[PDB]
Structure formats: structure tokens, C-alpha cells
Amino acid sequence: QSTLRRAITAAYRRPETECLPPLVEAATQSKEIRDAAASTARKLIEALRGKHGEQFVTGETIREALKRSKELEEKGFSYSYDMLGEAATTAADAERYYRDYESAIHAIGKASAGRGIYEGPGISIKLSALHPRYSRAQAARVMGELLPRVKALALLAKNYDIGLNIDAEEADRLELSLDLLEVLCLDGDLSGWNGMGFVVQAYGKRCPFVLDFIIDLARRSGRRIMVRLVKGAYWDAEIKRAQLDGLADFPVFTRKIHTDVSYIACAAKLLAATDVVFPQFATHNAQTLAAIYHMAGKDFHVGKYEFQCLHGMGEPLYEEVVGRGKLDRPCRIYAPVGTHETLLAYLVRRLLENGANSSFVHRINDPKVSIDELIADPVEVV
Amino acid sequence: SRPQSTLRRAITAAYRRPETECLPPLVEAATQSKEIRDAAASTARKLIEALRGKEQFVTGETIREALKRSKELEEKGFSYSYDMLGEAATTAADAERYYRDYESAIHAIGKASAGRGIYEGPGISIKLSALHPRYSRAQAARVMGELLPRVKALALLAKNYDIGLNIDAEEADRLELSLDLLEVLCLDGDLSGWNGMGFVVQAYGKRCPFVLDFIIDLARRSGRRIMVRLVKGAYWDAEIKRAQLDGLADFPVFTRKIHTDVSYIACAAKLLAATDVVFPQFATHNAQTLAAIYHMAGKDFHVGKYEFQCLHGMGEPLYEEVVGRGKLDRPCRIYAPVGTHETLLAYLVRRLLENGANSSFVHRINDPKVSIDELIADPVEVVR
Ligand SMILES: Cc1cc2c(cc1C)N(CCC=O)c1c([nH]c(=O)[nH]c1=O)N2C[C@H](O)[C@H](O)[C@H](O)COP(=O)(O)OP(=O)(O)OC[C@H]1O[C@@H](n2cnc3c(N)ncnc32)[C@H](O)[C@@H]1O
Ligand SMILES: Cc1cc2c(cc1C)N(CCC=O)c1c([nH]c(=O)[nH]c1=O)N2C[C@H](O)[C@H](O)[C@H](O)COP(=O)(O)OP(=O)(O)OC[C@H]1O[C@@H](n2cnc3c(N)ncnc32)[C@H](O)[C@@H]1O
């Protein structure tokens, strides 16, 4: 319990109208940056509009996925591999997912061949795959059996010097996963390894306060935490859970423009802290990308920050970003690995993403949507 | 005793009966002779070899557009049931809006029907969750008393045009209320002389055969020939998750996919023996299921005896090998969603969970590791 942790708990269901003023202020950029980002975003979108579930899986096995990664790695992309599987319901399921993560780390770490955590591939895990009652069991007990398993995987990732990222899932599990992150970052057995990563979801009202906590945790622990900033994949489920809960105040925003403002405000916070964290800006939205690209300034080196995208979704955009003929910024591809069976839940989230009229990836193909609208700055519209 | 005490008690008794206890009667009723099994395998092989030979889910943004796009397949012998996309109304104004959409749709469908009747002409499908703002949460007394006048009014309009009006099936915990509503409507004298009322029953539910017993007996005492759409069920993943959260030791649906297949065939046998008082509507995209029912029904057929059904954008390739004199000479009604993205997502997700699952026929037909031998195998032989 600390002041920084208390700010997280207090924001859980803070009224949406009270959350926004600090985010609007933090997301307000200078005119020069807004004009430059509008220019870059227009160029990216004009390139995109000149362009156009097997498409979402990189390979059935990690051996297959590693082989298919060589082409894009020489173009300037990196990878984070996702062994598909989540929401384990039995001990045997959780055990199989653990062994899949373990064998993937060995294969990825050997494939990395000393490239390190920024140039080389990493892995992403879901805590719900590793505990059989993750969402339906008491938080303290879950962390007690979960911690040995995650620490063991982190130690393997440290052995090979690869990244290991904890994906973010439902809002009611943020606190648990955050407690696990702190324990690992203070664990002396993992010293000297900067590969521990953590996702934060900008559609959550707690997002800026989680980031404050993580930035301070990195500074005091000496671990350069990899922080993947996403908007959030579970919006429809969080709304439906909240409506059943009968609460007037949800843990997430209810207007897409509020999430957009929150993302930019949180990106500003992360870019001001690149000494102690490694920001990873996961988005397919060209306006969001352009804003962050200019927010970050003229100084860049590999390891300062990176972009990220999903396999099968982000390559048309990020082919206009990676490489010396483009923006010369790196992008890490999130790469699902597994069978069609384990793919289903991920596919459903991709459908809610790709099929929503509010999504950038749908609007880019919508004849009713002008380029002028696609490059609108969310602060100026909110 | 209470009215229909025995039949109603049998439904309640099955609600969460152990799965192993549910299956033996279903396996017996779903067992067919070797000769019929041989003929059905031949038909299913033909259908699949035809199939493996050769936005997509919405028929139009408005009912007028959807009706225009229906002419081509109706000329071939298909019929339609239109689904104005919308469900799980959260406000009272949302429910009134959905009501007015159904009302306007019935007028348009009824005009387009132009007197073709409930079997050859188009009909409509409704969801009760669209018509009450707290359908899943509110007490049954309140839900019934506000929903019943709305559904009666829509049924009266359907009667006035002589079109079908089907109540779709949703979550398992809504079955009891929807069935009580069906009974009150079938006994309502204001709807007399119209056989267009329809009702969906989900064969992945343990209650399915006992619900069918109740519906067949209701048809006998009401004088209505009830249209019964037999489906396997669209909410399987959600029911499993809900039952786990609810702390249940036994679920209201089957957990082995072939058990649902056996349940479906057993319930088709029950419906096919009652075509005097119900109109069976066999909704499936599975060519093995279709072939089994086609042969179970025997050689005598006329339009109005029974029909098949399929979803727009999923079933037309299969049923183009079924409709028509040169094929199987059996009709098929296409379920036709009408709307925009503001109501499409929830349908898409149920469709993706259907199309994306390793166990689904529509996925297995495209799976190189699944032989035609396995696709035509009778599931009843696997469990017998
Ligand atoms: C690119 C990426 C995304 C995600 C993950 C990694 C990478 C590299 N990651 C792992 C995969 C898990 O699904 C991850 C994600 N989400 C999450 O909660 N935890 C994780 O660990 N990833 C998905 C990500 O959150 C996001 O959904 C997508 O990238 C799309 O967002 P993007 O910035 O590309 O696109 P926009 O279209 O500008 O935004 C879409 C998002 O907007 C939000 N939304 C939509 N309607 C809203 C309303 N009415 N109110 C509030 N917010 C709304 C949603 O978040 C929507 O996704
Ligand atoms: C064709 C059709 C389908 C449905 C409806 C109308 C028509 C014309 N109808 C309205 C649309 C609603 O979404 C309807 C449906 N479902 C429902 O519960 N209520 C309704 O009012 N419709 C969908 C239908 O139930 C079904 O999902 C599909 O047609 C697919 O079934 P089909 O016979 O095509 O395919 P099969 O692949 O042989 O079987 C798939 C089904 O098997 C069940 N399943 C999946 N996993 C299972 C496990 N582990 N145990 C037990 N059962 C399992 C599911 O029912 C799955 O759909």
C-alpha cells in the first residue's frame, strides 16, 4: 500500500466527467506538433487507402512461426509470440499452457541468439492461462500459486535475454497482475534483466495512475519495464459486466474519443520517462501513431521506444513506418501461435475490433469517412 | 392436477439432469435401420462432394431492400424469414423502437407475400429480448404482462397478412417464460384460424424433447398447427461460461458435440411423427444431419409437411443441392438478417463462434484433415 497504489484504487470507477480534464490537458500538443502530426497522418492514410482466421495466426507451432519471421525481421520488424490459450478451466489446461510457454521460451531464446530484448524476439503470456480459476478465485490465493510459475518463466527469459510480457485482460484482474509485476521487479533472482513487460489499457480510468506506479517502480527497482500501451480489447465485455453490476460508473470509458484522449495523454507520460521504462505503442490508428511519432521528438535510438501491431492487421500501416525510407522507427509484431481451436477467442476479439464502425481499421475502408476526419486530433474534437 | 402437470414437470426435471442420464432415450429414438443409414450416407456423400466442389450475412439494410433481393432465390423455390437485427434492449425506448421496426416489417413482408400463405410466402422472426427492456433480469410476472400485449399485437398483424411469425430461442434461462407466452398466444381466440405462429427449440438443451412434447400437446389442444424450428443452438459458449459462474454442478446444455447431434435427430423423429399438428422446420447447415432427416421422413412429401432452413450467407450452397425437382425436391427457408452495423455485431459473433469452431460442420468441410468418411458418419453410431 502506497500513495501511488491508492491513486489507482480511487480511480477505479471515478466519474467519466472527472477523469477527462487532466487527460485533455496532458494530451494537448503544441500547434507545431499538431500540424506536423496532421501532415504525417495524412501521408500515412493516403498510402493506406492506396492499399486494401488464418490471416491472424503466424504459425501452428513456434518452430513454424520462427521460420516465417525471418523475412520481416530483416525489414526492421521484431516479434512477440503469443502461444494461444487463455481462461484455463482445469489444472490440466493450466499445466499444458505452462508447458507451451516454457517450450516457446526455449525456442525463442535460442532463436534470439543474443540479439537482446529490443532487437530480438520476445514472448507474451496471459495470467488466465496459468491459473485454473484465475477470474473466479480469491486474488491473494491466485497470486500465491501463480507467482512461482511466472517467476520460473521469467528466469528462463532472463537466461536467454528475451522480453516476457504480461498481457492485460479484464479490468477486475488489473490489481492482481500489478501486484505480481511488483514482486518480480523486486526479486533479486531476476536482476540485470530488463525484459519484463506489462500491458496497460487506455480505456481504463486507472490507466494514468497505473503508469505513474509503474514508472516509479521501474525507477526504484532498476528494471527498465517494457510498457505496452494499448487502448483495450474487452470493451463490450466490460460494459456488459458493468451493466449487470448495476453501477452508474464503469471501470472503462464509454465514448471512443475519451479512450483516444487517454491514450495520447498516457503516451505523453511514457515518453517523458524513457530513461526508466521502454514504451511500446500498440496501435493500428495512423493518427495515433503520427501524434506519438512527433511527440517523441527528433532524438531516437533503438531501445528508446517502439511501436507494435497485430499480425495480419498492422503490416500495411507499418510498412510505411519501419525502415530508412520511411519513418525509421521499429515495430514489434504480436504473433499468435497455435491451432484453430485455441484461436477462437482471439478471433472473436479481432471481429469486435475490425467490425466496429468506430474502429480505425474499418473507417479507413469506409467511403463515408473523409481523410480530414481520420486525421482529426481527438483533443480538438472532445 | 395443475394444467399439463405431467408435461411441465418433465421439462423442469430435465433442466439440469445429468448428461449421461439424458442420452440413452435420445440414442434409441435417433437409431435408424442399417438400410436408411446406408441411403443417408449416400445422400450425404453426394451433398458434400457437390459442396467441396463449389456483410455476407445481411440481406439488406432495410426491409424494402431485403424484399427486393429475395426475388431471385424465391423464383428457385426458397422462402424467407426476415430478422430485423436487434435484441437485448436495455431501455424502454429501445424496446418500443424494436417493436415499431417489427410492426413496419410485418406490413412490408405481408404486402410482398401477397397472399402466398405461411408455407410458400415469407415470414418474420422476432426476439423477445428486443421487446422488453430488462428481459433477462426482470421478474416473469412483469415481463409477461408487458411483453404479451406487444407480441399479441405483432401476431395479429401477421395473421391479418397470413404470414409466419417465429419466436427465436435465446439463452436457456429464458426458455420457460417464452414457452408460457407461446401457450397463451396459441389459446387466444383472437388469433384463431392462423397457423403462422412459430417457436424455436434448441437441441443442445437437455429439456428439448420434453419441450417438444409440451408443444405438440399444445398444438393438439389449441387447434393451432405450430411451426417448430429445430436448431442445435447458437449460445453454447455463453451457456458454458454462465453455468460455471453460477456455480452449477450440471449444465443446461450438452458438453459433447455429438450428443447435440443425437439429440437433434431424436427430436426430428418426434416432430416427423406429429406433422398433423406441427410444421417441422429443420434448421441446419450440416449435410449429414440433413440427409438423415430427409430419409427419416420417408418417401411421401408435399409442401407444408416440413421444410429445411438455413442462414443467409451460410446455407445457400448446400441447399442449392436440395431445393428443386432435380435435387432432393425439398423446400428451404432462408433466415435473412436486415439492418446495419449498429445491430449486426452480436449476430456476427454468434456466426463467428459457429463458423470458427473446430467442431462445426462448416469448418470441418474446409479442413484437409477431415475425410469425407468422417463427415458422413452417423453420430448415433458413435454413442450407441
Ligand atoms: C496492436 C496490439 C493490440 C493489443 C495487444 C498487442 C498489440 C501489439 N495486446 C495483446 C492482444 C490482446 O488482445 C492487448 C490488447 N488489448 C488488451 O486489452 N490487452 C492486451 O494485452 N490489444 C488490442 C488493443 O487494445 C486494441 O483493441 C487494438 O489495438 C485496436 O485499437 P487501436 O489503437 O488499433 O484502434 P482504434 O480503432 O483507434 O481504437 C479502437 C479501440 O477503441 C476503443 N473503443 C471503441 N469504442 C469505444 C467506446 N464506445 N468507448 C471507449 N472506448 C472505445 C477500444 O479499445 C477499441 O479497441
Ligand atoms: C439455420 C438456422 C440456425 C439458427 C436459427 C435459424 C436458422 C434458419 N435461429 C436463429 C438465429 C440465431 O442466432 C436460432 C439459432 N440458434 C438458437 O439457439 N436459436 C435460434 O432461434 N440458429 C443457429 C443454430 O442453432 C446453430 O448454431 C447452427 O445452425 C449450426 O448448427 P448446424 O446443425 O449447422 O452445425 P453442426 O456443426 O452440425 O453443429 C454445430 C452446433 O453444435 C453445437 N455444439 C458445438 N459445440 C458443442 C459441444 N462441445 N457440446 C454440445 N454441443 C455443441 C452447437 O449447437 C453448434 O451450433
JSON list of N, CA, C and O in Angstrom, two decimals, chain B residues 275-303:
[
{"chain": "B", "resi": 275, "resn": "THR", "atom": "N", "xyz": [-46.63, -34.46, -37.76]},
{"chain": "B", "resi": 275, "resn": "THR", "atom": "CA", "xyz": [-46.83, -33.40, -38.75]},
{"chain": "B", "resi": 275, "resn": "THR", "atom": "C", "xyz": [-48.30, -33.05, -38.95]},
{"chain": "B", "resi": 275, "resn": "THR", "atom": "O", "xyz": [-48.58, -32.04, -39.61]},
{"chain": "B", "resi": 276, "resn": "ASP", "atom": "N", "xyz": [-49.22, -33.82, -38.38]},
{"chain": "B", "resi": 276, "resn": "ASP", "atom": "CA", "xyz": [-50.63, -33.42, -38.39]},
{"chain": "B", "resi": 276, "resn": "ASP", "atom": "C", "xyz": [-50.87, -32.15, -37.57]},
{"chain": "B", "resi": 276, "resn": "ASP", "atom": "O", "xyz": [-51.78, -31.38, -37.88]},
{"chain": "B", "resi": 277, "resn": "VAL", "atom": "N", "xyz": [-50.08, -31.92, -36.52]},
{"chain": "B", "resi": 277, "resn": "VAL", "atom": "CA", "xyz": [-50.36, -30.79, -35.63]},
{"chain": "B", "resi": 277, "resn": "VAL", "atom": "C", "xyz": [-49.20, -29.83, -35.45]},
{"chain": "B", "resi": 277, "resn": "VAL", "atom": "O", "xyz": [-49.36, -28.76, -34.85]},
{"chain": "B", "resi": 278, "resn": "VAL", "atom": "N", "xyz": [-48.01, -30.17, -35.97]},
{"chain": "B", "resi": 278, "resn": "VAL", "atom": "CA", "xyz": [-46.91, -29.22, -36.03]},
{"chain": "B", "resi": 278, "resn": "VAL", "atom": "C", "xyz": [-46.30, -29.23, -37.43]},
{"chain": "B", "resi": 278, "resn": "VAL", "atom": "O", "xyz": [-46.40, -30.22, -38.17]},
{"chain": "B", "resi": 279, "resn": "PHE", "atom": "N", "xyz": [-45.67, -28.11, -37.78]},
{"chain": "B", "resi": 279, "resn": "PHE", "atom": "CA", "xyz": [-44.92, -27.96, -39.03]},
{"chain": "B", "resi": 279, "resn": "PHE", "atom": "C", "xyz": [-43.43, -27.96, -38.69]},
{"chain": "B", "resi": 279, "resn": "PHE", "atom": "O", "xyz": [-42.91, -26.91, -38.30]},
{"chain": "B", "resi": 280, "resn": "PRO", "atom": "N", "xyz": [-42.72, -29.07, -38.84]},
{"chain": "B", "resi": 280, "resn": "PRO", "atom": "CA", "xyz": [-41.29, -29.08, -38.51]},
{"chain": "B", "resi": 280, "resn": "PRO", "atom": "C", "xyz": [-40.46, -28.30, -39.51]},
{"chain": "B", "resi": 280, "resn": "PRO", "atom": "O", "xyz": [-40.63, -28.42, -40.72]},
{"chain": "B", "resi": 281, "resn": "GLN", "atom": "N", "xyz": [-39.49, -27.57, -38.97]},
{"chain": "B", "resi": 281, "resn": "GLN", "atom": "CA", "xyz": [-38.60, -26.73, -39.76]},
{"chain": "B", "resi": 281, "resn": "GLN", "atom": "C", "xyz": [-37.19, -27.07, -39.30]},
{"chain": "B", "resi": 281, "resn": "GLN", "atom": "O", "xyz": [-36.78, -26.68, -38.20]},
{"chain": "B", "resi": 282, "resn": "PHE", "atom": "N", "xyz": [-36.46, -27.80, -40.14]},
{"chain": "B", "resi": 282, "resn": "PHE", "atom": "CA", "xyz": [-35.17, -28.36, -39.74]},
{"chain": "B", "resi": 282, "resn": "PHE", "atom": "C", "xyz": [-34.06, -27.41, -40.15]},
{"chain": "B", "resi": 282, "resn": "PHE", "atom": "O", "xyz": [-33.60, -27.41, -41.29]},
{"chain": "B", "resi": 283, "resn": "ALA", "atom": "N", "xyz": [-33.61, -26.59, -39.20]},
{"chain": "B", "resi": 283, "resn": "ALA", "atom": "CA", "xyz": [-32.58, -25.58, -39.43]},
{"chain": "B", "resi": 283, "resn": "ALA", "atom": "C", "xyz": [-31.20, -26.19, -39.18]},
{"chain": "B", "resi": 283, "resn": "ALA", "atom": "O", "xyz": [-30.85, -26.47, -38.03]},
{"chain": "B", "resi": 284, "resn": "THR", "atom": "N", "xyz": [-30.43, -26.37, -40.24]},
{"chain": "B", "resi": 284, "resn": "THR", "atom": "CA", "xyz": [-29.08, -26.92, -40.11]},
{"chain": "B", "resi": 284, "resn": "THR", "atom": "C", "xyz": [-28.31, -26.65, -41.39]},
{"chain": "B", "resi": 284, "resn": "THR", "atom": "O", "xyz": [-28.89, -26.61, -42.48]},
{"chain": "B", "resi": 285, "resn": "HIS", "atom": "N", "xyz": [-26.99, -26.50, -41.25]},
{"chain": "B", "resi": 285, "resn": "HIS", "atom": "CA", "xyz": [-26.09, -26.44, -42.40]},
{"chain": "B", "resi": 285, "resn": "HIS", "atom": "C", "xyz": [-25.29, -27.72, -42.54]},
{"chain": "B", "resi": 285, "resn": "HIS", "atom": "O", "xyz": [-24.39, -27.78, -43.39]},
{"chain": "B", "resi": 286, "resn": "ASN", "atom": "N", "xyz": [-25.57, -28.73, -41.73]},
{"chain": "B", "resi": 286, "resn": "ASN", "atom": "CA", "xyz": [-24.79, -29.96, -41.68]},
{"chain": "B", "resi": 286, "resn": "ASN", "atom": "C", "xyz": [-25.43, -30.96, -42.64]},
{"chain": "B", "resi": 286, "resn": "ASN", "atom": "O", "xyz": [-26.57, -31.39, -42.45]},
{"chain": "B", "resi": 287, "resn": "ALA", "atom": "N", "xyz": [-24.68, -31.32, -43.69]},
{"chain": "B", "resi": 287, "resn": "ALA", "atom": "CA", "xyz": [-25.24, -32.18, -44.74]},
{"chain": "B", "resi": 287, "resn": "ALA", "atom": "C", "xyz": [-25.53, -33.58, -44.23]},
{"chain": "B", "resi": 287, "resn": "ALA", "atom": "O", "xyz": [-26.42, -34.26, -44.76]},
{"chain": "B", "resi": 288, "resn": "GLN", "atom": "N", "xyz": [-24.80, -34.05, -43.23]},
{"chain": "B", "resi": 288, "resn": "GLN", "atom": "CA", "xyz": [-25.11, -35.35, -42.65]},
{"chain": "B", "resi": 288, "resn": "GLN", "atom": "C", "xyz": [-26.43, -35.30, -41.89]},
{"chain": "B", "resi": 288, "resn": "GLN", "atom": "O", "xyz": [-27.27, -36.20, -42.02]},
{"chain": "B", "resi": 289, "resn": "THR", "atom": "N", "xyz": [-26.63, -34.26, -41.09]},
{"chain": "B", "resi": 289, "resn": "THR", "atom": "CA", "xyz": [-27.90, -34.08, -40.39]},
{"chain": "B", "resi": 289, "resn": "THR", "atom": "C", "xyz": [-29.05, -34.00, -41.38]},
{"chain": "B", "resi": 289, "resn": "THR", "atom": "O", "xyz": [-30.10, -34.64, -41.19]},
{"chain": "B", "resi": 290, "resn": "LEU", "atom": "N", "xyz": [-28.87, -33.21, -42.44]},
{"chain": "B", "resi": 290, "resn": "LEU", "atom": "CA", "xyz": [-29.92, -33.02, -43.44]},
{"chain": "B", "resi": 290, "resn": "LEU", "atom": "C", "xyz": [-30.28, -34.34, -44.09]},
{"chain": "B", "resi": 290, "resn": "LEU", "atom": "O", "xyz": [-31.47, -34.69, -44.19]},
{"chain": "B", "resi": 291, "resn": "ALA", "atom": "N", "xyz": [-29.27, -35.10, -44.53]},
{"chain": "B", "resi": 291, "resn": "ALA", "atom": "CA", "xyz": [-29.54, -36.38, -45.19]},
{"chain": "B", "resi": 291, "resn": "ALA", "atom": "C", "xyz": [-30.26, -37.34, -44.27]},
{"chain": "B", "resi": 291, "resn": "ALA", "atom": "O", "xyz": [-31.14, -38.09, -44.70]},
{"chain": "B", "resi": 292, "resn": "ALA", "atom": "N", "xyz": [-29.90, -37.34, -42.98]},
{"chain": "B", "resi": 292, "resn": "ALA", "atom": "CA", "xyz": [-30.54, -38.24, -42.03]},
{"chain": "B", "resi": 292, "resn": "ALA", "atom": "C", "xyz": [-32.03, -37.96, -41.91]},
{"chain": "B", "resi": 292, "resn": "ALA", "atom": "O", "xyz": [-32.85, -38.88, -41.89]},
{"chain": "B", "resi": 293, "resn": "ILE", "atom": "N", "xyz": [-32.39, -36.68, -41.83]},
{"chain": "B", "resi": 293, "resn": "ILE", "atom": "CA", "xyz": [-33.79, -36.30, -41.70]},
{"chain": "B", "resi": 293, "resn": "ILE", "atom": "C", "xyz": [-34.54, -36.54, -43.00]},
{"chain": "B", "resi": 293, "resn": "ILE", "atom": "O", "xyz": [-35.67, -37.03, -43.01]},
{"chain": "B", "resi": 294, "resn": "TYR", "atom": "N", "xyz": [-33.90, -36.22, -44.13]},
{"chain": "B", "resi": 294, "resn": "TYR", "atom": "CA", "xyz": [-34.54, -36.44, -45.43]},
{"chain": "B", "resi": 294, "resn": "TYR", "atom": "C", "xyz": [-34.99, -37.89, -45.59]},
{"chain": "B", "resi": 294, "resn": "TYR", "atom": "O", "xyz": [-36.10, -38.15, -46.06]},
{"chain": "B", "resi": 295, "resn": "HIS", "atom": "N", "xyz": [-34.14, -38.84, -45.19]},
{"chain": "B", "resi": 295, "resn": "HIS", "atom": "CA", "xyz": [-34.51, -40.25, -45.29]},
{"chain": "B", "resi": 295, "resn": "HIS", "atom": "C", "xyz": [-35.41, -40.70, -44.14]},
{"chain": "B", "resi": 295, "resn": "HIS", "atom": "O", "xyz": [-36.27, -41.56, -44.35]},
{"chain": "B", "resi": 296, "resn": "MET", "atom": "N", "xyz": [-35.25, -40.13, -42.95]},
{"chain": "B", "resi": 296, "resn": "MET", "atom": "CA", "xyz": [-36.14, -40.45, -41.84]},
{"chain": "B", "resi": 296, "resn": "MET", "atom": "C", "xyz": [-37.58, -40.11, -42.19]},
{"chain": "B", "resi": 296, "resn": "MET", "atom": "O", "xyz": [-38.51, -40.83, -41.82]},
{"chain": "B", "resi": 297, "resn": "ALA", "atom": "N", "xyz": [-37.77, -39.00, -42.90]},
{"chain": "B", "resi": 297, "resn": "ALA", "atom": "CA", "xyz": [-39.11, -38.52, -43.21]},
{"chain": "B", "resi": 297, "resn": "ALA", "atom": "C", "xyz": [-39.82, -39.41, -44.21]},
{"chain": "B", "resi": 297, "resn": "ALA", "atom": "O", "xyz": [-41.04, -39.31, -44.34]},
{"chain": "B", "resi": 298, "resn": "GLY", "atom": "N", "xyz": [-39.10, -40.27, -44.92]},
{"chain": "B", "resi": 298, "resn": "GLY", "atom": "CA", "xyz": [-39.75, -41.18, -45.84]},
{"chain": "B", "resi": 298, "resn": "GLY", "atom": "C", "xyz": [-40.06, -40.56, -47.19]},
{"chain": "B", "resi": 298, "resn": "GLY", "atom": "O", "xyz": [-39.73, -39.41, -47.49]},
{"chain": "B", "resi": 299, "resn": "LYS", "atom": "N", "xyz": [-40.76, -41.36, -48.00]},
{"chain": "B", "resi": 299, "resn": "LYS", "atom": "CA", "xyz": [-40.94, -41.06, -49.42]},
{"chain": "B", "resi": 299, "resn": "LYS", "atom": "C", "xyz": [-42.09, -40.09, -49.70]},
{"chain": "B", "resi": 299, "resn": "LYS", "atom": "O", "xyz": [-42.09, -39.44, -50.75]},
{"chain": "B", "resi": 300, "resn": "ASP", "atom": "N", "xyz": [-43.07, -39.99, -48.81]},
{"chain": "B", "resi": 300, "resn": "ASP", "atom": "CA", "xyz": [-44.23, -39.13, -49.07]},
{"chain": "B", "resi": 300, "resn": "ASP", "atom": "C", "xyz": [-43.91, -37.70, -48.66]},
{"chain": "B", "resi": 300, "resn": "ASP", "atom": "O", "xyz": [-43.55, -37.45, -47.50]},
{"chain": "B", "resi": 301, "resn": "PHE", "atom": "N", "xyz": [-44.03, -36.76, -49.59]},
{"chain": "B", "resi": 301, "resn": "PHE", "atom": "CA", "xyz": [-43.79, -35.36, -49.27]},
{"chain": "B", "resi": 301, "resn": "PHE", "atom": "C", "xyz": [-44.73, -34.45, -50.06]},
{"chain": "B", "resi": 301, "resn": "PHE", "atom": "O", "xyz": [-45.05, -34.71, -51.22]},
{"chain": "B", "resi": 302, "resn": "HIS", "atom": "N", "xyz": [-45.11, -33.35, -49.42]},
{"chain": "B", "resi": 302, "resn": "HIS", "atom": "CA", "xyz": [-45.82, -32.26, -50.06]},
{"chain": "B", "resi": 302, "resn": "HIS", "atom": "C", "xyz": [-45.41, -30.98, -49.35]},
{"chain": "B", "resi": 302, "resn": "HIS", "atom": "O", "xyz": [-45.05, -31.01, -48.17]},
{"chain": "B", "resi": 303, "resn": "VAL", "atom": "N", "xyz": [-45.46, -29.86, -50.07]},
{"chain": "B", "resi": 303, "resn": "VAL", "atom": "CA", "xyz": [-45.13, -28.59, -49.44]},
{"chain": "B", "resi": 303, "resn": "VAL", "atom": "C", "xyz": [-46.14, -28.29, -48.35]},
{"chain": "B", "resi": 303, "resn": "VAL", "atom": "O", "xyz": [-47.36, -28.31, -48.59]}
]
